[PDB]
Ligand binder design. Sequence first.
Ligand SMILES: Nc1ncnc2c1ncn2[C@@H]1O[C@H](COP(=O)(O)OP(=O)(O)O)[C@@H](O)[C@H]1O
Ligand SMILES: [Cl-]
Ligand SMILES: [Cl-]
Ligand SMILES: [Cl-]
Ligand SMILES: [Cl-]
Ligand SMILES: [Cl-]
Ligand SMILES: [Cl-]
Ligand SMILES: [Mg+2]
Ligand SMILES: [Pt+2]
Length: 165
Amino acid sequence: APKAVLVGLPGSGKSTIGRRLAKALGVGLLDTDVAIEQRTGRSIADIFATDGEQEFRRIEEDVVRAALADHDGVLSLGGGAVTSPGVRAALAGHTVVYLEISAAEGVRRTGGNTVRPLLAGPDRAEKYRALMAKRAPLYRRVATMRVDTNRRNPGAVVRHILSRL
Ligand SMILES: Nc1ncnc2c1ncn2[C@@H]1O[C@H](COP(=O)(O)OP(=O)(O)O)[C@@H](O)[C@H]1O
Ligand SMILES: [Cl-]
Ligand SMILES: [Cl-]
Ligand SMILES: [Cl-]
Ligand SMILES: [Cl-]
Ligand SMILES: [Cl-]
Ligand SMILES: [Cl-]
Ligand SMILES: [Mg+2]
Ligand SMILES: [Pt+2]
């Protein structure tokens, strides 16, 4: 099982804390989005456009289930994975770290146009707040550890987790 599975909104730090936490532990980081693009060969966007939500989530759950069983390092879960009941079920029993972030800080951490589908240019703040209202209850439901990252620098978040593992 993974040493830790990181979940949270876009910009909460899943990729960043994931990479840094994995390095600290001397283990590897597996990003479900990356695993999906490498399993299929197509990009996230392409899968959504062609196949669409339902098909994506299905491929995603499949990748997530294999990761939870085969990966022993740090696992960073795609932000919408928890919307799938099957994923929430698969997570039961694992160490799940919910990286919490405010909407104001979250929207600002993701302003780099690093490909944020759900956060289209027009009124990103409103969209981000809506995303939070929808996803937060789910992250809270699957989390075994909650970590506020609002005023904590990345290294502090990593040390916080490391000390609790
Ligand atoms: N604790 C933090 N303090 C300051 N900036 C952070 C922190 N965590 C993440 N960030 C920054 O916010 C951006 C989004 O981080 P990222 O790991 O890609 O988030 P996610 O994978 O959850 O979408 C990155 O540029 C990252 O360096
Ligand atoms: Cl995300
Ligand atoms: Cl399973
Ligand atoms: Cl590993
Ligand atoms: Cl299960
Ligand atoms: Cl909000
Ligand atoms: Cl909130
Ligand atoms: Mg990520
Ligand atoms: Pt909120």
